[PDB]
Amino acid sequence: SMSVKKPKRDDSKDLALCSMILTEMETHEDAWPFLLPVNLKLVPGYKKVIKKPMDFSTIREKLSSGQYPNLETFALDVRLVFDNCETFNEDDSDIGRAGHNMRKYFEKKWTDTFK
Incomplete structure (x- = not known):
């Protein structure tokens, strides 16, 4: 609260570590x-369904x-990528499996680097 703070975590490397x-x-x-934005002209249904x-x-x-x-805002966007993927792609598809794999990969790096 006012004039009552937890000890200051060193956040000075976060930017570099998120980049890595x-x-x-x-x-x-x-x-x-x-790697790239979904082409909203060429992929039917994407624009309407995937709000972000x-x-x-x-x-x-x-x-x-x-x-x-x-x-936290960085992790939210990364996760959004995989949440979108799940919304649009069957689990039993190459892209569907890609999303699950990348999410796992991310979550481990995230925990190891920051928790």
């Missing part, structure tokens, strides 16, 4: 469905331009 995680996601062999499209290149641009105020 994102690099590792970008270079994973199953990242291909997620997100992809790795968009996260990268937001990260590089100071549009994440903290590491």
Whole structure:
């Protein structure tokens, strides 16, 4: 509360560490469905169904331009990528399996780096 604070966590490396995680996601062999925005002209149903499209290149641009105020907002966009994937793709599809794999990969890096 006012004049009552928990000890100050060192957040000075968060930006660099989120960048490294994102690099590792970008270079994973199953990242291909997620590297670029879904083409909303060419993919029927996507625009109407997926209220907040997100992809790795968009996260990268937001990260590089100071549009994440903290590491929670960064994780929310990463997860949004996989939540969108699940909304639109059958579990038993290449993209569906890609999403589950990348989410797992992300969550481990996230826990190991920050928890």
